[PDB]
């Protein structure tokens, strides 16, 4: 239901209670005084909005500056509906709009916290994508390597770059809830790592060499296969649904 184990742990217990509450209200007693638990919701919302507003002002990521403020409004407005429901139930424990204001307030808080969490996740995924694109671009440089000096420089750059990408993917896949997505990330990453020494070997033969056309074909083939896997990783990293 939630694509990462952080979002799942945080939201799924509360998302299940809200669904249940909606089903109960549809088919179907006095609601007790909700003053103390609503105040706890208010104190948490106030902290989230204050810290959130501070992030909006300091960040350089224009997407956060754009997507975070509407989500705050969503959580703030939903909290206002919750504060109204508790004030209604204190005066009337059998109140009808109070039960609707609780549902509306719960839905809105979950909606806004979901938006916030998804926005933070898209931002982390953008960071991984930048590292992937970096590798893709460095794979395009392979075709201009003509000498052993260049091969040594290329190998010293690509080697650590691949290790950082492999570590980012390994850590991202552990965090995912859907198995089909984890398998695709692991499979593609393994192929990339396996084909890297094969690329360096193909380029060594090219630096060594009719005969040139064969060594060039194999180097271009490896870059093509590695590039296709990297572009598949970029695609899979952006998936939030279904399998």
């Amino acid at each position: 239901v939630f694509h990462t184990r952080t979002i799942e742990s945080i939201l799924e217990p509360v998302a299940q209670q809200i669904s249940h509450l909606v089903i109960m209200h549809e088919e179907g007693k006095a609601i007790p005084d909700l003053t103390a638990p609503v105040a706890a919701v208010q104190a948490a919302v106030s902290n989230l909005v204050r810290v959130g507003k501070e992030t909006v002002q300091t960040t350089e990521d224009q997407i956060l500056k754009r997507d975070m403020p509407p989500a705050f409004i969503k959580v703030e407005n939903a909290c206002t509906k919750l504060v109204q429901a508790a004030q209604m139930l204190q005066s009337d424990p059998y109140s009808v709009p109070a039960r609707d204001y609780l549902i509306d307030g719960s839905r809105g808080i979950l909606s806004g916290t979901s938006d916030l969490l998804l926005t933070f996740d898209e931002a982390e995924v953008r960071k991984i994508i930048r590292v992937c694109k970096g590798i893709l671009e460095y794979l395009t440089v392979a075709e201009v390597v003509e000498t052993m000096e260049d091969l040594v420089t290329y190998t010293k750059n690509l080697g650590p770059g691949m290790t950082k990408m492999a570590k980012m993917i390994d850590e991202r896949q552990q965090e995912l809830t859907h198995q089909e997505h984890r398998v695709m990330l692991v499979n593609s990453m393994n192929t990339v790592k396996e084909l890297l020494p094969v690329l360096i070997s193909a380029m060594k033969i090219f630096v060594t060499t009719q005969g040139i056309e064969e060594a060039l074909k194999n180097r271009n083939f490896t870059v093509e296969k590695m590039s296709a896997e990297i572009n598949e990783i970029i695609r899979v990293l952006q998936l939030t649904s279904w399998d």
Partner: peptide, 22 residues
């Protein structure tokens, strides 16, 4: 992560509110 933790506090408090209703 502070923002994620502040979101967690909100969800935990909301969960407590809903269980207090019935």
């Amino acid at each position: 992560v502070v923002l994620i933790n502040a979101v967690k506090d909100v969800a935990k408090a909301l969960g407590d509110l809903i269980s207090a209703t019935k």
